[PDB]
Design a protein around this ligand. Sequence first.
Ligand code: 1JS
Ligand code: ZN
Ligand code: ZN
Length: 287
Amino acid sequence: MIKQRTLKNIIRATGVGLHSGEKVYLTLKPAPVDTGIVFCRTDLDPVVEIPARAENVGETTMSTTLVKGDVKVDTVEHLLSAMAGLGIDNAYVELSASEVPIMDGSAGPFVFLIQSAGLQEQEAAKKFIRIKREVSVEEGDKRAVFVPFDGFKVSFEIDQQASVDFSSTSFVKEVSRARTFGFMRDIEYLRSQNLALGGSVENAIVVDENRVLNEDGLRYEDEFVKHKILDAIGDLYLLGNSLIGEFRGFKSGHALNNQLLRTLIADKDAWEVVTFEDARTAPISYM
Ligand SMILES: O=C(CC[C@H](NC(=O)c1ccc(C#Cc2ccccc2)cc1)C(=O)NO)NCCCO
Ligand SMILES: [Zn+2]
Ligand SMILES: [Zn+2]
């Protein structure tokens, strides 16, 4: 069957939060069947543990932020995108500060870390959620939609357009390395308000409103929209189970992505859990 997956070994990384500029240790730990992804702030006294699910998303300014009371874990989207990408169902993530490290601005480092810990298949069927009926949410000129589709595909447009199928196209090769990005004008403002403190050309693409300022250039011709697809995959993983359907994003950010998840969850007629006792017949394959 398509089994649930966790990490083989504990693995650690160090980095800096994009927004906070704070040094943070990130420890990924194997977890048992039906755990999901749980975060653990190990700097707080007492430690605060926060499941990576839709209901725990509290703020959605420039990143997905998990909250419990007055305690936050923000910028979970790139790490969760890596998890989704490698099909990791269960893991503990222990963090020494409020923000996940930015690493190189992409999911690449996290993908490589997860693989370096080794994957461990677990003897329990992996539960997917099938989209049975179209579900969409909008607000102004933003739109977020799930459409039925026997597989998993993402199409996204921003202010430009990319479509990726995760049967034909490798998350690792074509999406994982896409770095976050910002406009100088924006970056200047955020720095003035004590934000983006961990930002640099080493973990973010910088453009004015003309050209890429990074000396070494782009990793993909359409890196910007590819990164937005990466973010949506991460935000969609807060569902807590892998999706069988097509997601269409039109200028959709963290807030509207979480709103789509909430609507889908509450609209039970639109979805159903399914497992695959035969990996050959399954619409989604992992490594
Ligand atoms: O939609 C987006 C991108 C999606 C977003 N990234 C961000 O917010 C984001 C914010 C700030 C930075 C920076 C910086 C820096 C670079 C060099 C020196 C000093 C500082 C990079 C990314 C993200 O990755 N969300 O998950 N708009 C660009 C935001 C600003 O125009
Ligand atoms: Zn964002
Ligand atoms: Zn991002």
